[PDB]
Each structure stands twice: as structure tokens, then as C-alpha cells.
Design a protein around this ligand. Structure first.
Ligand code: 402
Ligand code: SF4
Ligand code: SF4
Ligand code: SF4
Ligand code: SF4
Ligand code: FES
Ligand SMILES: [Mg+2]
Ligand SMILES: [Mg+2]
Length: 580
């Protein structure tokens, strides 16, 4: 078919939208509410307006190309329409970029600047308290920034299929929020924060823990531990203009020391701990023939999904604590035993690509003897802001090293942040455990990649077992609802709520939609992790020397005794009751 765009003739067989055909041919069209191959069906932002000859102004993002269209993307009538829409958005928008947390990478600001748009009347609310919801342990809303673009609603729908983020009719006016405007925590919401990632502005954010951290750092008698997740070292460089897929591990350690932290450890150490315990439990369940299947339990997004939708699976969850919590538990017990610190004075902070980790850390029973496993969780974005506020030249920092005692990690722990990561690492140790051997082939490439549902057959000690990797919360629903779970007998199942794994977590750096169609963000971030695994000497969690010492000298044998006593956590379904 033949179309004309800005006087340029195209002959094409492609059946796509104006927007995508234009972007494919280096023709500029703006968009706002269009994301994840979806726009806002009930309140189209119309930022993507173009002029079609013989029709008038149309939305490019959801209008298919047709033979014989004459399209103008830059006529004065088009630009005045787009400018008008942005101005109306400004009319309901607290335009104060100064102290805003999206100041450095906001899509809306870029649009305002591009079209020179201004409000008819500035939005200047005196009392923000009614626009702000900070009840959640993981999420916050600032409706002074909200454009009602529906991108959070669509993303929540696509990524989780819970539809926990909804349009609401609050006293005759439209907002976004949880069901019945309740606290997100009190709904079926997973707190995975995929909504935040989709948000073009600062309307959706993580629940801040930065005050917890600063207060602890400035408290004389507090000994503040910090440990970052696998994914952080593969991501945080993005916010310092270092590009995508840059390993910045050593720079992070240096920055944390300069921030005033008293001990620099690593969650990857906790990852090796979780494998120690979970691979042990797997081997146990084999020689007890059940309960099968065993599900991973390190994703609090998935744990909440199970609690809210599949409580019959809670007893199938591994009882091993997550790397975050299992690390935290040892930081209040083992670490004092090798440091002399009063356990009460230890304050443990993690850096996570995740918002759901904050909820996990603040679970009432995630403590012992009055001591929280984890006292604070800051996202990748929060650590970045903290670094920038301290004016630490991150990109120029020299590499330092972590403190070894709870900072060493194997290549198995290092790949936790990728979908299929926990599966692969668990298998490397479960195999060696069950066969009493030191096997050389350790790469399970079949469980890797961005496929939503991944299965593999594995041969453990002259017996064959079935594993599955569930990549994304919506895929958990598909896997269960479509009866896939009953099509064969599964023995070990990994579930991550965020598609791509933690590298694509709700607390990660935002990425411009244009960059998203240019960079495979999930694969590129994960590539850093697998790279570290490939070039590390020890690639099994039980080959972690610092970890072995810890178990030999303090916890004893994994999966039992002291180790099972305090390094494990069991989820329980509510007892039957009526009503509901
Ligand atoms: N706790 C824990 Fe995990 C580990 O190790 C993280 O820290 Fe993850 C990452 N990156 C997060 O958030 S959680 C899910 N298990 C996969 S990776
Ligand atoms: S959300 Fe964007 S446009 Fe609005 S105040 Fe913040 S930086 Fe400025
Ligand atoms: S919270 Fe963000 S993504 Fe959701 S409607 Fe408001 S501006 Fe759009
Ligand atoms: S945190 Fe996750 S489940 Fe909850 S509303 Fe946001 S995207 Fe949906
Ligand atoms: S996949 Fe990772 S980042 Fe996403 S909710 Fe689970 S633990 Fe958090
Ligand atoms: S981007 Fe097309 S209507 Fe919003
Ligand atoms: Mg649409
Ligand atoms: Mg201090």
C-alpha cells in the first residue's frame, strides 16, 4: 500500500499503526499514554495527534495505516492541538521540578519543554495531604503529579493480571489507586512496583526508607551494615549517564564507604545462603518424596500472589528465608559473634531493585529477640539519589572491595537477579549434594531467557525430575489457570513476579520508552550478572569460603538444627472460617 507522510511517499506491505511506521522511518511523533503496546482507551492523551487528509486529526498510536493516507505530523493545527493537551495536563499538575524525584528523567517535562506549553492556571494546592497516599510499606502516590494517562493501570494488567491498580471515581473526580481506595497492602496488590516503572512522572514512587538510613548513620552507637542485591551492580550506572549494561560493582562499594556505612557486605552472600538451605531442602524432599512441587520463596511479590490467590501452595514454598532476610538474620546473630558488636546496635540496610522487599523487611515476624532481620530497604533509585545528594562523583570513583566475612559470593549467587537464576544456582548445589560429587557441567541454559514459562527435565542421581521457571506474575496465573501445573509432576518451581527477574524490578531506574525499543533492558542488565558468574572462580554457593566458615563455626549443618531454626520462615494459610 501507498501512504504519504509529510510529503514523503512510502510503499509498504506492513500492517501497523501510524506511530510505529513513523518511528520505524525516522519520523518524529510524540506519545505519552502509549506504552506496552497500549494507550489510554477511555481518556486518550492525544499527544500523538497527526493530521490525516480527508479525515482530520487522529491519534497515531492506535490508528492503523491504510493505502492512500496523506499524513501531516507537524502542521500548525497538529502542534496547537498537542500543545493544548499538554497545557490542560499542566492545569492539573504541580509544576515544581526543583525538589521532584523525577527531575532528571521525566517524560512530561520533556514534552512541556518540546512544545513550549504553559498552564492556563497553575496548579498550586495548599494541602498536599489529600493528594498523597503514603500508607503502603512499598508504594506511595502523589496525585499532584498524576496525568491520568493510565500507564500504571495498563502495566499492572499486563505484568500481573491482578488489576490491583484501578481507575477510581473519588467523589465525582477520577483518580488512580487501589481497590476501594484502600492501602495497596490491604488488597491483592503484589507491591511489585511495575506500576511505578510505567509511570512517566513522579506520581508513583517507592515508600522512602532514606530517613531510616540517615538517622541510623548519624546515630553514634549504631553500626550500620549495607548490602546490595545482585541486580543493583548491573543497573545503578544508568542514573549516572554511564549507559546500559555496565558492571559498577567496585564503584558501588566505594560510594557506600563514602556515604558513611560502617560495614560493606553483599546480598549475593545471602543468595549463597538461600541456596545452601534451599538446595538442602530440595534433596530432602526427594528422599522423602514430597511435598512436590517445591516453589521458591525469595520473591515477596510471588509470596503475596500465593497468599492472595493460591494459599493452598503456601505449604509448598521453600522455608528458606530470602537472600535479603536470611542475610539480615545472620547479621544480628553470626556477625556479632565474629565482630564483638552488641546485636542491638547493629542496623542492617539492603539496596534492592525492588519495592516489595520493603514489605518483606517489615513483616512483623521477620525478627528475633526484638531485633529486626532487616531495618531498612532502599531501592536502586534511592541509593542513586543518596549518592548524588552527597555529591559523590560516582562515575569517576575507583573500585574498592566488599568486607569478605558476609561479602564474598559465588557465581551462583551472582545470577539471582535474572529469571531462571535461582533455579540454575539451586541445581548446581542440589546436584552435587544428592550425588555426593563435584560436577563440572553447571550451566543450565534451558532455564534462562525471557520466555514467560520455562520448563526443563533434569537428571538428579539417576532419577529424572521436572523443573519450571515462571517468569512474571501474569505467567504464574497462566501456568496455574491453564492447568499446566497438573499436566506433569513438577518437583521444583521458580517464580518471579517481575518479568525478566529482579533486573526489571519495581525499584529500578526508569527507562525512556524510546530507549526501551532501542535496548533490551532485561537482557542487557542480566548480561552483567551471567558475565560475573562466568569469570568467577567459585560458581557454586557451597564453594563460598566465607560462607563455609560461617556454617562450620556458627550454624552447623544447613537445613536442620540451628540453621533450620532461625534461617527459615514458614508461610501458613488462614484456617477455614465463615463467613469469607
Ligand atoms: N532477597 C533476594 Fe534476591 C537475591 O539474591 C534479591 O536481592 Fe532479588 C535481586 N537482585 C531482589 O529484589 S529477590 C528474588 N530472588 C531473586 S534475586
Ligand atoms: S513530575 Fe516531571 S514535570 Fe512534574 S514536577 Fe516532577 S519533574 Fe517537573
Ligand atoms: S500514576 Fe503515573 S502512570 Fe498512573 S495514571 Fe498517573 S501519571 Fe499515569
Ligand atoms: S505494585 Fe504491582 S500488583 Fe500492585 S498495583 Fe503496582 S503493578 Fe499492580
Ligand atoms: S521479581 Fe525481584 S524485584 Fe520483582 S517483586 Fe520479586 S523480588 Fe522484587
Ligand atoms: S499516545 Fe496516542 S492517545 Fe496517548
Ligand atoms: Mg488503545
Ligand atoms: Mg554512623
Amino acid at each position: 500500500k501507498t501512504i504519504i507522510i509529510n510529503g514523503v511517499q512510502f510503499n509498504t506491505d506492513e500492517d501497523t499503526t501510524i506511530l510505529k511506521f513513523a518511528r520505524d522511518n525516522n519520523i518524529d511523533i510524540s506519545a505519552l499514554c502509549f506504552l506496552n503496546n497500549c494507550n489510554n482507551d477511555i481518556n486518550k492523551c492525544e499527544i500523538c495527534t497527526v493530521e490525516v487528509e480527508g479525515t482530520g486529526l487522529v491519534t497515531a498510536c492506535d490508528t492503523l495505516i491504510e493505502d492512500g493516507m496523506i499524513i501531516n505530523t507537524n502542521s500548525d493545527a497538529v502542534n496547537e492541538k498537542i500543545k493544548s493537551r499538554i497545557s490542560q495536563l499542566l492545569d492539573i499538575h504541580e509544576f515544581k521540578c526543583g525538589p521532584c524525584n523525577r527531575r532528571e528523567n521525566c517524560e512530561f517535562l520533556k514534552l512541556v519543554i518540546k512544545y513550549k506549553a504553559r498552564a492556563s492556571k497553575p496548579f498550586l494546592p495548599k494541602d498536599k495531604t489529600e493528594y498523597v497516599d503514603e500508607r503502603s510499606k512499598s508504594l506511595t502516590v502523589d496525585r499532584t503529579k498524576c496525568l491520568l494517562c493510565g500507564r500504571c493501570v495498563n502495566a499492572c494488567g499486563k505484568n500481573t493480571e491482578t488489576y490491583a491498580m484501578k481507575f477510581l471515581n473519588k467523589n465525582g473526580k477520577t483518580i488512580i489507586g487501589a481497590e476501594d481506595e484502600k492501602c495497596f497492602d490491604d488488597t491483592n496488590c503484589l507491591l511489585c512496583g511495575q506500576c511505578i516503572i510505567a509511570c512517566p512522572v513522579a506520581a508513583l514512587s517507592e515508600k522512602s526508607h532514606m530517613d531510616r538510613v540517615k538517622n541510623a548513620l548519624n546515630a553514634p552507637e549504631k553500626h550500620v551494615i549495607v548490602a546490595m542485591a545482585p541486580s543493583v551492580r548491573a543497573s545503578i550506572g544508568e542514573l549516572f549517564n554511564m549507559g546500559f549494561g555496565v558492571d559498577v560493582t567496585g564503584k558501588i562499594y566505594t560510594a557506600l564507604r563514602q556515604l558513611g556505612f560502617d560495614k560493606i557486605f553483599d546480598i549475593n552472600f545471602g543468595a549463597d545462603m538461600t541456596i545452601m538451605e534451599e538446595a538442602t531442602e530440595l534433596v530432602q524432599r526427594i528422599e522423602n518424596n514430597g511435598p512436590f512441587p517445591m516453589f521458591t520463596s525469595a520473591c515477596p511479590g510471588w509470596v503475596r500472589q500465593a497468599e492472595n490467590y493460591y494459599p493452598e501452595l503456601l505449604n509448598n514454598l521453600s522455608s528458606a528465608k530470602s537472600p535479603q532476610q536470611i542475610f539480615g538474620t545472620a547479621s544480628k546473630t553470626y556477625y556479632p559473634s565474629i565482630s564483638g558488636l552488641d546485636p542491638k546496635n547493629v542496623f542492617t540496610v539492603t539496596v534492592m531493585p525492588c519495592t516489595s522487599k520493603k514489605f518483606e523487611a517489615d513483616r512483623p515476624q521477620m525478627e528475633k529477640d526484638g531485633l529486626r532481620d532487616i531495618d531498612a530497604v532502599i531501592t536502586t533509585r534511592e541509593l542513586a539519589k543518596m549518592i548524588k545528594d552527597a555529591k559523590i562523583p560516582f562515575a569517576k570513583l575507583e573500585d574498592s572491595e566488599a568486607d569478605p566475612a558476609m561479602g564474598e559470593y559465588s557465581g551462583a549467587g551472582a545470577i539471582f537477579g535474572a529469571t531462571g537464576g535461582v533455579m540454575e544456582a539451586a541445581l548446581r548445589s542440589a546436584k552435587d549434594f544428592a550425588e555426593n560429587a563435584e560436577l563440572e557441567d553447571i550451566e543450565y541454559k534451558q532455564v534462562r531467557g525471557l520466555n514467560g514459562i520455562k520448563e526443563a527435565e533434569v537428571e538428579i542421581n539417576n532419577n529424572k525430575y521436572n523443573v519450571a521457571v515462571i517468569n512474571g506474575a501474569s505467567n504464574l496465573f497462566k501456568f496455574m489457570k491453564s492447568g499446566m501445573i497438573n499436566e506433569k509432576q513438577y518437583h521444583f518451581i521458580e517464580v518471579m513476579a517481575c518479568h525478566g527477574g529482579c533486573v526489571n524490578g519495581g525499584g529500578q531506574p526508569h527507562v525512556n520508552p524510546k530507549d526501551l525499543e532501542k535496548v533490551d533492558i532485561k537482557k542487557v542488565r542480566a548480561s552483567v550478572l551471567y558475565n560475573q558468574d562466568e569469570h568467577l572462580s567459585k560458581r557454586k554457593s557451597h564453594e563460598n569460603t566465607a560462607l563455609v566458615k560461617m556454617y562450620q563455626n556458627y550454624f552447623g549443618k544447613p537445613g536442620e538444627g540451628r540453621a533450620h531454626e532461625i534461617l527459615h520462615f514458614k508461610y501458613k494459610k488462614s484456617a477455614w472460617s465463615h463467613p469469607q
